[PDB]
Amino acid sequence: NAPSLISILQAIEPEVVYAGYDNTQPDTTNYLLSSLNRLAEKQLVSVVKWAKALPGFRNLHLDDQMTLIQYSWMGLMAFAMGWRSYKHTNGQMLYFAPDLIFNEQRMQQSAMYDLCQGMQQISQEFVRLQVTQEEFLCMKALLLLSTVPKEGLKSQASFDEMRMNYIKELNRAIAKKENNSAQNWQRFYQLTKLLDSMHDLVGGLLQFCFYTFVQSQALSVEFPEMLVEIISAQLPKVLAGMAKPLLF
Ligand SMILES: C[C@]12CC[C@H]3[C@@H](CCC4=CC(=O)CC[C@@]43C)[C@@H]1CC[C@@H]2C(=O)CO
């Protein structure tokens, strides 16, 4: 038989981005958030590259490709970050990158404190659930495929199939470990529930994101160029209520 989606997914998994951050410079809500954004630009590149590698994704109309990316990019980055914070700090600290890890001081200095907390609860779940790589890779894959424009998609049928497949491979991945039916079931539930709770958080995140974006010169937070492009193109569709979370 052919190499599984997970085999491919483990292969196309992006390397960890460094922020470029200076940790000697003091913790100032403007410096922090500017720095975060630089990173989001660094990640956005790795994410899109990632999505192009992602089996079936190239087979969607370019309209859909860019839209999905436009909607899911925030959740993708927050989730991967939930994952990293789990592996590297076991949920205690927010591990944006090896050179830019938030602790308590910096979550406070962030002026997003309640959102940090939320992202943390996400990593803490990763921890509670002892999520595995393979569950993670498939979850993240589904996370992309979990916020679609309400007016439908060019490639609709092909997408629904992809979604199907990534649920199927999330199933292959929970099934490893044995347990049989019932345990599996609760698992599937918990994971997908974790996925579904993602939208919630992304909500607050986009919200504060836009907020910070509009008021950028007001707040002295430096959004880089690719970041300008993407947030901008996302913003009006999002407000319009074009984007609709797919749930379980
Ligand atoms: C976009 C954002 C800065 C960048 C991060 C995001 C939260 C999660 C996140 C994960 C990453 O590992 C990279 C950057 C990023 C996407 C923040 C949510 C609010 C904050 C701002 O709105 C300030 O720009």
Author numbering: -1 to 246
Q: Can I see the authors' text?
A:
We first used X-ray crystallography to determine the structures of bacterially expressed AncSR2-LBD in complex with progesterone and with 11-deoxycorticosterone (DOC), at 2.75 and 2.82 Å resolution, respectively. The structures reveal why AncSR2 did not yet distinguish between progestagens and corticosteroids, which differ only in that the latter contain a 21-hydroxyl. The two protein backbones have nearly identical topologies (RMSD = 0.28 Å), and there are virtually no differences in the ways the ligands are bound. The AncSR2-progesterone complex contains ample room to accommodate the additional 21-hydroxyl of corticosteroids. Further, Asn35 offers a perfectly positioned hydrogen bond partner, which is unpaired in the AncSR2-progesterone complex, for DOC's hydroxyl. This additional favorable interaction explains why AncSR2 not only accommodates corticosteroids but is even more sensitive to them than progestagens. AncSR2 does not distinguish strongly between progestagens and corticosteroids because it has only a weak preference for steroids with a 21-hydroxyl. Taken together, these data indicate that the promiscuous responses of both AncSR1 and AncSR2 to non-target ligands are due in large part to unfilled volume in the internal cavity and untapped potential of polar side chains to form hydrogen bonds with polar atoms on the ligand.
SRs are hormone-activated nuclear transcription factors with distinct specificities for endogenous steroid hormones and exogenous substances. In all SRs, the activating hormone binds in an internal cavity within a well-conserved ligand binding domain (LBD), causing the LBD to change conformation, attract coactivator proteins, and increase transcription of target genes. AncSR1 is the last common ancestral protein from which the entire SR family descends by a series of gene duplications; AncSR2 is the ancestral protein of all naSRs. In contrast, AncSR2 was completely unresponsive to estrogens (and cholesterol) but strongly activated by low concentrations of diverse nonaromatized steroid hormones, including progestagens and corticosteroids and – to a lesser extent – androgens.
